[PDB]
Ligand binder design. Structure first.
Ligand code: CA
Ligand code: CA
Ligand code: CA
Lengths: 161, 161
DNA sequence: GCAGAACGTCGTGAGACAGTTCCG
DNA sequence: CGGAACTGTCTCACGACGTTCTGC
């Protein structure tokens, strides 16, 4: 299993060269809420250091997708979805510092999702947490995320709520 | 006073946003050899995250120097010298992965320095290890450090060897 | 005489997604 | 569908010193 010092290290490395983010994906094919909330954490590194990503991958149960080269000589390792994150984030959270908040927001989103997936009003509250996470990843002088505001208007205009 | 997971986290963070390097500092007022092999590890972070550095600083016995702004919106924390590094690195080496080689090469330099101090020939050998550490911090397609070649030419030309 | 503390910065190595394609 | 896997990349956030100031 993942030992304490391994999780501590990964958390430190994630606080350094990694990212914890959420996004709203337009889904034209979806049926009433034409969006899918995507959740993920990733580690990024110069391609020559790809082996170290592979090592973290193994320690995390081989969950996620490794990419030897994004195309710009950079390599990355991304773990998408509640399935993997529900198991991984709990192991890292006690050690995360810089990105600890973002991690908790993702976990919050994961627990709210089942009942928000087909309920416009609950979906909006969940979208507010998505904006929070995107803003936590922005400098203070950057335009804040406005997914909640935009979807609230969309939902009203469509009668959904 | 550093717990395993505390050291592992720091190691992971350093592997992420830190640096472990060695360099030659020209010393106009030195008496046989006019240079000093300076050693250090540093943590770098966007100014707005300075407080996380202040925390690591405290966890490492408050050794080193904290800069809220290098002058470009970037903050950093630098630990210079064998005195501090001879205590700090041994604690981090067990958990460093990416910069592990650099930490050990610095520890090596620390153990050879006393004798290389006033021995041009030994000083050069030690400088070779400085070049190794600088090379470790380069891509494979970059110019390899020339501290050894340039110092040797200076020493011969100055009749020191 | 010796060395750490500060300062300054070119050259990127990252981040944080946006899109688009793939799969049970 | 419902969601994950793969592609792609704009905008910085770093790095790893070279150089100069301070201290005993
Ligand atoms: Ca970083
Ligand atoms: Ca890095
Ligand atoms: Ca970084």
């Amino acid at each position: 299993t993942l030992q304490p010092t391994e999780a501590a290290y990964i958390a430190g490395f994630l606080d350094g060269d990694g990212s914890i983010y959420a996004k709203l994906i337009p889904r034209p094919d979806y049926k009433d809420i034409k969006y899918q909330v995507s959740l993920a954490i990733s580690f990024i590194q110069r391609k020559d250091k790809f082996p170290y990503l592979q090592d973290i991958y193994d320690q995390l149960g081989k969950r996620g997708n490794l990419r030897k080269d994004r195309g710009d000589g950079i390599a990355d390792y991304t773990i998408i979805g509640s399935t993997h994150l529900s198991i991984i984030l709990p192991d890292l959270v006690p050690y995360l510092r810089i990105k600890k908040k973002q991690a908790n927001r993702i976990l919050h989103i994961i627990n709210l999702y089942p009942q928000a997936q087909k309920n416009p009003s609950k979906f909006l509250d969940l979208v507010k947490i998505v904006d929070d996470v995107q803003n936590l990843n922005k400098r203070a002088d950057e335009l804040k995320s406005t997914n909640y505001d935009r979807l609230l208007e969309e939902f009203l205009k469509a009668g959904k709520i």
